[PDB]
From TrEMBL, chains A, B:
This is D-glycero-beta-D-manno-heptose 1-phosphate adenylyltransferase. Residues 26-132 form the Cytidyltransferase-like domain. The keyword Cell membrane does not apply. The keyword Transferase applies. It comes from Burkholderia pseudomallei (strain K96243).
Amino acid sequence: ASFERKLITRDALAAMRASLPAPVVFTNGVFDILHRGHVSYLADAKALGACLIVGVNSDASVRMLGKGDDRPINVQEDRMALLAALECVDWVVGFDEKTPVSLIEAVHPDILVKGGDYDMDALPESALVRGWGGRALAIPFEHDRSTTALLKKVRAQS
Amino acid sequence: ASFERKLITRDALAAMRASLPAPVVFTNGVFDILHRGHVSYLADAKALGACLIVGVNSDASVRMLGKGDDRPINVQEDRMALLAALECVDWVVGFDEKTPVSLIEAVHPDILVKGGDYDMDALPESALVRGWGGRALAIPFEHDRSTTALLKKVRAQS
């Protein structure tokens, strides 16, 4: 229950914003079932900055899109709790709207990241963040990294 | 990528054992699809000691027991990576034998913990761990309903 210290409300995160370590990194998603691409990317996003905030679609909100799952099999509190259990995540915030734009406006990240192959120029939130001089970028889900090759290289040795 | 520092082989962990913070806590499982009960359980296991090590059954190992489904949805390295990403987990080791008995022999944990109401006296590793002055105990673990589980597996497959 200790990782639950990361679950926070938009209002509380807004009050705390000024005291967060720069650069503040933001990402959002449904995160219905965590897989390795999710955590690999959650870790790299953390590595870009000093602080990582994850926005999580409410159950109603998730119902707003036809892209992914209309109805997530895990309730928003459970999806958020899993994220909070992660070493690389600092803060987990839910949002109800269909897009994370007003959440992002409130949070004011220095860096916005998306996991997957997504044209960042087609995203409203990219424009929002770049609008005040921040950065927006897509981090691929599974890519061959130097840190991976190395650590496992280490594994064979045994 | 940083989290992968936790994936290690039995031999290297055994050599490193003496310098780990005592008491060393051990638990093992398949951990196919993580849910909130898993992470709640792993945090409670961590709170029992100063260091947490997770034994992860190999695909092959999973084929030999009647727990859950005969086959897993995620390969061993993905299941181990998911666990290693958890804040509360310190070391993730994969074993190939039917049970974790030999691994526990090599690791020498000071505390063996299982989730659920399980007669610990019926486990060989309990006697083993108690035999060298360690502890073995069960702590409550919340399982997800079979339906949700079946829906989860399906989702994974998709």
